[PDB]
Amino acid sequence: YSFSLTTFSPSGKLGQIDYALTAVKQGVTSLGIKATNGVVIATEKKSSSPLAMSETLSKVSLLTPDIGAVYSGMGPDYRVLVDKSRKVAHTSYKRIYGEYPPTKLLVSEVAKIMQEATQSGGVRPFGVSLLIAGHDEFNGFSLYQVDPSGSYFPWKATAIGKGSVAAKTFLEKRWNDELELEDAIHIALLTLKESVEGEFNGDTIELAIIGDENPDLLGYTGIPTDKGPRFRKLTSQEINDRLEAL
Amino acid sequence: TTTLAFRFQGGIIVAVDSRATAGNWVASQTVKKVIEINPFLLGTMAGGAADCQFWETWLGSQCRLHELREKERISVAAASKILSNLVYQYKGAGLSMGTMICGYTRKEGPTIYYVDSDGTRLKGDIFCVGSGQTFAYGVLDSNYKWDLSVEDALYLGKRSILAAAHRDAYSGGSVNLYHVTEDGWIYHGNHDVGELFWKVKEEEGSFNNVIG
Amino acid sequence: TTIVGVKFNNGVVIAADTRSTQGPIVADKNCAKLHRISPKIWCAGAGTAADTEAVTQLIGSNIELHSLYTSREPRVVSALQMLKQHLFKYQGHIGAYLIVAGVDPTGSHLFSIHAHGSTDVGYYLSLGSGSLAAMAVLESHWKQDLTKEEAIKLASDAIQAGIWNDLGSGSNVDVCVMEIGKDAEYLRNYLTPNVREEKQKSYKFPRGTTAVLKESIVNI
Amino acid sequence: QFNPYGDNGGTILGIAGEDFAVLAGDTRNITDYSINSRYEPKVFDCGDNIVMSANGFAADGDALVKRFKNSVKWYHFDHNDKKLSINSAARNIQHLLYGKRFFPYYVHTIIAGLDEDGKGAVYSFDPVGSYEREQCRAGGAAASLIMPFLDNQVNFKNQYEPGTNGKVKKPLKYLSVEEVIKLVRDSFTSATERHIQVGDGLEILIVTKDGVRKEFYELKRD
Amino acid sequence: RATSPLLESDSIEKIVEIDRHIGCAMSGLTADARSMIEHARTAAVTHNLYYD
Amino acid sequence: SIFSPDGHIFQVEYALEAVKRGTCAVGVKGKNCVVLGCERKLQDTRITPSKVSKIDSHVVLSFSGLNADSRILIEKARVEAQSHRLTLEDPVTVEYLTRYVAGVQQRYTQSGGVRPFGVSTLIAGFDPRDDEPKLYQTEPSGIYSSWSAQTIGRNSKTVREFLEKNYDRKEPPATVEECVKLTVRSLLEVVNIEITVVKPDSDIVALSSEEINQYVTQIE
Amino acid sequence: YDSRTTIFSPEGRLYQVEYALESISHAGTAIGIMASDGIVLAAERKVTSTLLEQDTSTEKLYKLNDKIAVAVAGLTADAEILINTARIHAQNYLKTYNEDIPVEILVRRLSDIKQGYTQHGGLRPFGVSFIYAGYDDRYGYQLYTSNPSGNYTGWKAISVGANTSAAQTLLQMDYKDDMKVDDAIELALKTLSKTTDLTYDRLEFATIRKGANDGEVYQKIFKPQEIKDILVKTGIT
Amino acid sequence: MDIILGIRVQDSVILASSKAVTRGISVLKDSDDKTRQLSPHTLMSFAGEAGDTVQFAEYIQANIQLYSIREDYELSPQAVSSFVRQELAKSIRSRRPYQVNVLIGGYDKKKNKPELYQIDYLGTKVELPYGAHGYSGFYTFSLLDHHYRPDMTTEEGLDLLKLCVQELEKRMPMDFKGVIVKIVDKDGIRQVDDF
Amino acid sequence: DPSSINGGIVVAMTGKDCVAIACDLRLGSQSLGVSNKFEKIFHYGHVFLGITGLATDVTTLNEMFRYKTNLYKLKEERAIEPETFTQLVSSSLYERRFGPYFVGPVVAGINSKSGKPFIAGFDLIGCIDEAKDFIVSGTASDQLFGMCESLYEPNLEPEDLFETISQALLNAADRDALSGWGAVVYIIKKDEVVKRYLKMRQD
Ligand SMILES: CC(C)C[C@@H](C=O)NC(=O)[C@H](CC(C)C)NC(=O)[C@H](CC(C)C)NC(=O)OCc1ccccc1
Ligand SMILES: [Mg+2]
Ligand SMILES: [Mg+2]
Numbered sequence A: 001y002s003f004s005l006t007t008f009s010p011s012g013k014l015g016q017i018d019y020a021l022t023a024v025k026q027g028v029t030s031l032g033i034k035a036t037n038g039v040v041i042a043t044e045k046k047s048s049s050p051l052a053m054s055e056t057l058s059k060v061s062l063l064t065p066d067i068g069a070v071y072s073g074m075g076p077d078y079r080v081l082v083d084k085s086r087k088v089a090h091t092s093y094k095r096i097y098g099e100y101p102p103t104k105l106l107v108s109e110v111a112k113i114m115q116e117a118t119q120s121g122g123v124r125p126f127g128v129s130l131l132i133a134g135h136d137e138f139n140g141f142s143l144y145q146v147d148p149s150g151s152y153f154p155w156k157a158t159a160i161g162k163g164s165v166a167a168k169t170f171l172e173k174r175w176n177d178e179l180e181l182e183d184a185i186h187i188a189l190l191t192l193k194e195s196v197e198g199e200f201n202g203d204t205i206e207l208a209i210i211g212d213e214n215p216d217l218l219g220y221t222g223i224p225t226d227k228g229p230r231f232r233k234l235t236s237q238e239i240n241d242r243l244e245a246l
Numbered sequence B: 001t002t003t004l005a006f007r008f009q010g011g012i013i014v015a016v017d018s019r020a021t022a023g024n025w026v027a028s029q030t031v032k033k034v035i036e037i038n039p040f041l042l043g044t045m046a047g048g049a050a051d052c053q054f055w056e057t058w059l060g061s062q063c064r065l066h067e068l069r070e071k072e073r074i075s076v077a078a079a080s081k082i083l084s085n086l087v088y089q090y091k092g093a094g095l096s097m098g099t100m101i102c103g104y105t106r107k108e109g110p111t112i113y114y115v116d117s118d119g120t121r122l123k124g125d126i127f128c129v130g131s132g133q134t135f136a137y138g139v140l141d142s143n144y145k146w147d148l149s150v151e152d153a154l155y156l157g158k159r160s161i162l163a164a165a166h167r168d169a170y171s172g173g174s175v176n177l178y179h180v181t182e183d184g185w186i187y188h189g190n191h192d193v194g195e196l197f198w199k200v201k202e203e204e205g206s207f208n209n210v211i212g
Numbered sequence C: 001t002t003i004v005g006v007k008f009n010n011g012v013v014i015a016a017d018t019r020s021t022q023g024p025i026v027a028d029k030n031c032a033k034l035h036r037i038s039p040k041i042w043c044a045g046a047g048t049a050a051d052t053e054a055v056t057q058l059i060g061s062n063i064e065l066h067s068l069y070t071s072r073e074p075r076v077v078s079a080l081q082m083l084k085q086h087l088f089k090y091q092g093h094i095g096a097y098l099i100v101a102g103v104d105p106t107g108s109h110l111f112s113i114h115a116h117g118s119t120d121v122g123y124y125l126s127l128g129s130g131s132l133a134a135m136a137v138l139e140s141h142w143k144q145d146l147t148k149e150e151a152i153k154l155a156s157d158a159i160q161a162g163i164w165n166d167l168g169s170g171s172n173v174d175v176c177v178m179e180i181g182k183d184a185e186y187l188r189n190y191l192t193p194n195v196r197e198e199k200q201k202s203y204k205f206p207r208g209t210t211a212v213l214k215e216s217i218v219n220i
Numbered sequence D: 001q002f003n004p005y006g007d008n009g010g011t012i013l014g015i016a017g018e019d020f021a022v023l024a025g026d027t028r029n030i031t032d033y034s035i036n037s038r039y040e041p042k043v044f045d046c047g048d049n050i051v052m053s054a055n056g057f058a059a060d061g062d063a064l065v066k067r068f069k070n071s072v073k074w075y076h077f078d079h080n081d082k083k084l085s086i087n088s089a090a091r092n093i094q095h096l097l098y099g100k101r102f103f104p105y106y107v108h109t110i111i112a113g114l115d116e117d118g119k120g121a122v123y124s125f126d127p128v129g130s131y132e133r134e135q136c137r138a139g140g141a142a143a144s145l146i147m148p149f150l151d152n153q154v155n156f157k158n159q160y161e162p163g164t165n166g167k168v169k170k171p172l173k174y175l176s177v178e179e180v181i182k183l184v185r186d187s188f189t190s191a192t193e194r195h196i197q198v199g200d201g202l203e204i205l206i207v208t209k210d211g212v213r214k215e216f217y218e219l220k221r222d
Numbered sequence E: 001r002a003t004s005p006l007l008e009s010d011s012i013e014k015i016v017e018i019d020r021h022i023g024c025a026m027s028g029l030t031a032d033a034r035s036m037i038e039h040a041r042t043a044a045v046t047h048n049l050y051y052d
Numbered sequence F: 001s002i003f004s005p006d007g008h009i010f011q012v013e014y015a016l017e018a019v020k021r022g023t024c025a026v027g028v029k030g031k032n033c034v035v036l037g038c039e040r041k042l043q044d045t046r047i048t049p050s051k052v053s054k055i056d057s058h059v060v061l062s063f064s065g066l067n068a069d070s071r072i073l074i075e076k077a078r079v080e081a082q083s084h085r086l087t088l089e090d091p092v093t094v095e096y097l098t099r100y101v102a103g104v105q106q107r108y109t110q111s112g113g114v115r116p117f118g119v120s121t122l123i124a125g126f127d128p129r130d131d132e133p134k135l136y137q138t139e140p141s142g143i144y145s146s147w148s149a150q151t152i153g154r155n156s157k158t159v160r161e162f163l164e165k166n167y168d169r170k171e172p173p174a175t176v177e178e179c180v181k182l183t184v185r186s187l188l189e190v191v192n193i194e195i196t197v198v199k200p201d202s203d204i205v206a207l208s209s210e211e212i213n214q215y216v217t218q219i220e
Numbered sequence G: 001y002d003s004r005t006t007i008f009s010p011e012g013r014l015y016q017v018e019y020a021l022e023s024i025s026h027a028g029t030a031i032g033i034m035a036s037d038g039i040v041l042a043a044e045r046k047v048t049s050t051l052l053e054q055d056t057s058t059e060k061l062y063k064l065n066d067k068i069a070v071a072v073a074g075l076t077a078d079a080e081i082l083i084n085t086a087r088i089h090a091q092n093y094l095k096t097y098n099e100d101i102p103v104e105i106l107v108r109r110l111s112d113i114k115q116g117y118t119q120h121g122g123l124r125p126f127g128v129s130f131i132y133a134g135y136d137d138r139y140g141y142q143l144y145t146s147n148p149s150g151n152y153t154g155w156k157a158i159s160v161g162a163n164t165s166a167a168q169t170l171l172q173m174d175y176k177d178d179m180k181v182d183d184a185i186e187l188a189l190k191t192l193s194k195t196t197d198l199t200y201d202r203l204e205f206a207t208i209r210k211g212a213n214d215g216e217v218y219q220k221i222f223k224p225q226e227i228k229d230i231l232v233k234t235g236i237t
Numbered sequence H: 001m002d003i004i005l006g007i008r009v010q011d012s013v014i015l016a017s018s019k020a021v022t023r024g025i026s027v028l029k030d031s032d033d034k035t036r037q038l039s040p041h042t043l044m045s046f047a048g049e050a051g052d053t054v055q056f057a058e059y060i061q062a063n064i065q066l067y068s069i070r071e072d073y074e075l076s077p078q079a080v081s082s083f084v085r086q087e088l089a090k091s092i093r094s095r096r097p098y099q100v101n102v103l104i105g106g107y108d109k110k111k112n113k114p115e116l117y118q119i120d121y122l123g124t125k126v127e128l129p130y131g132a133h134g135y136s137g138f139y140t141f142s143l144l145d146h147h148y149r150p151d152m153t154t155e156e157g158l159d160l161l162k163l164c165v166q167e168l169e170k171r172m173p174m175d176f177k178g179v180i181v182k183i184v185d186k187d188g189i190r191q192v193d194d195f
Numbered sequence I: 001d002p003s004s005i006n007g008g009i010v011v012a013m014t015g016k017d018c019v020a021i022a023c024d025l026r027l028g029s030q031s032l033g034v035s036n037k038f039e040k041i042f043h044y045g046h047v048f049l050g051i052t053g054l055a056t057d058v059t060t061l062n063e064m065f066r067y068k069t070n071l072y073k074l075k076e077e078r079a080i081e082p083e084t085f086t087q088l089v090s091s092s093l094y095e096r097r098f099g100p101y102f103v104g105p106v107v108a109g110i111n112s113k114s115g116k117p118f119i120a121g122f123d124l125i126g127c128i129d130e131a132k133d134f135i136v137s138g139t140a141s142d143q144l145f146g147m148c149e150s151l152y153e154p155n156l157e158p159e160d161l162f163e164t165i166s167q168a169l170l171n172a173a174d175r176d177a178l179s180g181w182g183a184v185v186y187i188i189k190k191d192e193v194v195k196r197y198l199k200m201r202q203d
């Protein structure tokens, strides 16, 4: 097994990457929306048993204080990418510059990780696509999709997984370049409501924003130059609040 | 030890003593300090006995292998460079070798390389090497001449090792003589200093520092 | 350098002087010796300044990864084990000497750690060249069940002892207060008892005082 | 500070005859001023009419003899029991020694046997592999006492024919095994008298076409 | 067995010296003889270095 | 899997199939020279890699087959040429260099996870201090041989038949101009043409399209 | 058996290399045109949605250093790997010699990396073709391509990706041996216009030319609106 | 110890290097050439540890020639000197450092200028109008500080070296057995037999 | 020790919307002065780095940092800032903790975004001197400390900063056998950089 398991077929296509995408297309819908003053990323929390506690799992993950991610496809592949992504942000960036990487470069590192699984001997590609929302001082807010191939594209808004065709369509109609974060959150909810079969509340929806710095989440005072984290995940309560007055 | 090689009109003379020592102990007076690598190539040994015997014998192996591989005798330059490259790999380990690599090919002509365990490799017309080198030099240099007859050259080489054997505590035994030409080396015998010294003192009227 | 640690009824206080010295020279007269391992875990260092800073960053980074991985608040004992194991592995050659203080879900903690990898625990501690002067104050004025304001005063008095009596120490007092149930409170230059007096004159030169051979614009 | 080397004293003696060789050693083994053993053999039959002694640091000596005997075993395996000739044994022992050039066996090696013309052979080695074939050689503790004596008695050095005004050397002559043993015995009784590290016993190995034989003689035990 | 008149048959080398007392002839896929010849020569010369 | 039942090596025989698909290459020995000729848009060709490469000042290599495979051999040969100068204090003979290159090829047919070179080569030039032109050919198998004139690649069977009846060992082309012409002729049988002339003691010169066009037109 | 990447077919063909080339022929088209005083790189974007963030990306053209750029066709993630080794190679050369790397030397090294994957190791080749645009003081302006075979050639004009034969024909038609960098731009846009299966949001564009202020060489990665304004002035508006 | 001198004049660089090779109380040779040509317009002279000097210089030469062949282009003096410097900087912190100091004379055919580089074994590099390694700089630097002009012909450079060598034969304690002088210019490298 | 074989000094100072950095020109080998033109100050974009110590390491670090910053600019698509470069220098130095470069680097520059003047110093293994009035380094660092603490005052105009850092360098150098032999001074503002060569004693 010291040979690639992803290889080219006569049509020039790479089967294992395509089949990886198929797995992604089969996953629960998730989406991202970029506003002028923030970005939102969202997904549904299908609990595969009512005896399961879905709060103990997290589909939306903080990567850096200013960068978060969500996914469609194979959950465990995602979990593992999250661990790798957090580490590479420290090992190839923060330990050298004393700064967290800007979004596009962190997206780029995760892309490398995924590209590698499509070429190295003895391994299948990752079966996930990630949406990654971040902010950095010189580029502002951004939003990227990474695919099992390691390809990444920047979006103003997009959806992935099962209900993505209708969701991308809904988003095409409602999106304009003057949404404020609150609009983007509202639109994300309306969008997720189509994809959602079954229950739809603050407990089956996961939602996070990259927005303003939160000094109250820093954990300490005294360094005034120290920026709060821009990433915040919305509580169950906060999500229901918006849902009632939808 | 005293060893010398020089180029002159009739080719190369090679001359060595045969004493080996440990501290002030004369361990032997019969040591062979020239190696016959092939019929056109000689090596001389000064410094560590083992270091010299071992590595020059090994050099002989590398030379033969070259011949099997390239279907030609190796050049003097390349043979001396094999030895030089090898010792340099060991630089600092504590090897102790002062050697001369001497011979003929048509390309180079009669050729002498000095090679030591420092990595020093030198082409030259005259070298004396060993604890007695300065004594050899003083005699050899004084009477050296490019147009020495072959006989006069053989004698001057012999007389120079003899001078070193007499004065250097660590040289002695006998003199081994070689002549090298375009047809390769030819051996000119082993000359015990025990009888050589007196013979030369008489014939020559030299060594007046000594009671006869 | 003078660093101390002082536990109180509801947390721990850490403090340091602000002088760093190239030999008998002061390089930085207002340096920062109070480092953050994590939001509520802070450490002060003496010994080799690069080692103290580097090892701080290494563990801080790892503590952060650990915390993200385990979805738990970092624990002071974790910083302790990671640091001592790292320092021990290096057999003393990383000359870091640290007082590490903090609060976490299990309570409030105070530890010291030496270059070879040994660690101590107590209610009050000192390290660095000025630690004997500071410890003399601690040994004279510590009592169980300090309030926050009393532990600040005591730690601040201890740093002062080193500032005044230890040539290795000087300038200002910095404190960090880590109280249970609250954000860590970092007080930079809590005390500044060593301001330079006004000089007798300005040494501004008349323009053109300095001889120039040639001049040119550089393009960035 | 660990010193990996020791000195176990002892002295050895090889003389070549026309159709025989002899390798002798004393049987005493020492440490500083103590006697470890009055009888610990150090001259060994290694097969193929090859006898060997590695004298000095006895731990290195034993190791070297062991490695060599093994070398013979494999020579035989590789070459259908072909006799290892003595010159071939010598070159091989050179390599064993020089293999450890940077951490040498602290010993003086002598081997004796017959050459391919059936003539007695002695070879002498320095601790790192330098060797020559010789007619006689003493090694070890009392070598500096015994060697000049052999120079004089085995090779007639400094003897002239009387009435010739010191112009005619006493001509070289092959000694018989009888005359050689006499010299060996006298060398050792002499060494025993003047060297504190020599005594107890004298073991002589005698090699001929018919094989290796052994004689033993007591030496003074003080 | 020159495969063409343009081949300089002098460079067809299917017999080689291993040592002064040993030579050899090869037949087959002859490029494979490279290693064998090399190894043989080294075996012969190494045996002489070690055993005289 | 490796050998067919009649004893061929599969991958090696397949390597020969690669050479056949390659562009035609030919070399011919004159009395005091050796010419190399190769065949070939909208491409820049002053910067594009040529089909003939200097190995050292006096030796060249050309090839037919998998183009990209040939760079590894060219590079390996150039390095060895310097190693040889460095250690023997003399440049390679053409024959030596050919052994080296062919030996590399043979090796790639006997290592695991490694494909044989899909190139055959022409190696030509003059030994140091010698004016007998030298010409060798190597194959993916690692076989090599000396030739008065030789061709490799597509339609080499055609070109070879041409040289067998137009090259006379008794009278090799007596001038560089004849030698070039015969080379150009040999190519026009199956042919944009490259020509490189090698004369003794490092006279290596590639003919421009111009001087080549002066040749081809006259022939026609 | 054509799954295995470093073994010959019975026709002496290398299948994985050939299939990698098939994949590339389905990628977004990239053109490169060399003028007397500059070079032009153009890439038509494979992916199109209206929600794609067209500005702030450039994902088919890449600066390798101050003097050399590439245009990509194939797996963009494959490309990034090799782009990164190249930038490193160029920096090592600068560090060793204190000179900028000659374009061909950077090209040969990447071509060698590609070649390696075809001869040993059992890993699939990279699914990318590159058009290299660069300047050095030895050869002036240069254009090269490389493909998964590990081959590379120099060009006066060239294309890779989809519809390559259609593009090559047009370029063979309207290429003057000594044009001007502003015309080569026009030609490039026309040729991408005649093969598009064409707006600014679907284009990436770059140039390398003498700064005219002065004597120096400049790499411009055109912004989206710049692409607009150059799309109208050449009558594709 | 070894004399190694360099003077860069208007149209050329000139290298002068002592002929003696001395071990203990023996001058072994009086005709030793302490240079290797790295390329047709680049020359390197060398001083330092026995063995290291030739081993280093030839290694560089081999590498430079390799580049010449691979690129069919001659690297600039500036590029070569930087490769030499880097090799020495790697050396000094390697398991066994070359103890070699070098001078590099080259004619930049593109810039049409002579350049002279002094690089020691640590990897310290500097370009200079004149340079020296060893104890010789203790006499030559001040002498040339007095006598050297920037406008000088090759012949004047030669006179300048006659002055230096005359002084070193006067004041240096060791008999360095004269020098070999080599001129590097637009036409390449040549040795001045009549020195 | 290695840090005093070649000799030389660097000093940097902040002023009002400006920074300045200066160095001598000497390269010697112990008592022998060798080069009269060995500058010790480099720049990567708008960030300046001065380096004292062992000349070979001075040169090595420069090349290492040009390499690192070039890659940074390519990947980040913007030039490195003085704050970020400072951390980069630190960690690069610390990476060689147990076999260090024998150097005393100094960073000066103006952040392109805040417009804020920035300086820093380092010990040979990367410890950062965060100080923001002045930083000194080299074989005359004592002298420099003395000169700076004396002559310096905050918020000097560039024209005045030029006189101050000049006199600090010149007078420190003349009390040091291993420093001097010429000097260069950079006055750095947002839109302009001026380099000047000072006239000084040549003994
Ligand atoms: C070819 C040589 C025989 C030339 C001759 C003089 O140059 N050399 C010698 O005579 C040198 C002495 C010299 C290095 C001062 N002697 C030697 O090399 C002798 C070998 C003879 C005694 C058989 N070996 C030696 O001195 O001791 C080696 C040693 C190594 C490790 C531990 C204990 C002892
Ligand atoms: Mg035998
Ligand atoms: Mg006794």
Ligand SMILES: [Mg+2]
Pocket (backbone or CB within 6 Å): D221, D222
């Ligand atoms: Mg007794």
Ligand SMILES: [Mg+2]
Pocket (backbone or CB within 6 Å): I137, I138, I139, I140, I141, I142
């Ligand atoms: Mg200092």
Ligand SMILES: [Mg+2]
Pocket (backbone or CB within 6 Å): I173, I174, I175, I176, I177, I178, I179, I180, I181, I203
């Ligand atoms: Mg001074």
Ligand SMILES: [Mg+2]
Pocket (backbone or CB within 6 Å): I202, I203
């Ligand atoms: Mg002075």
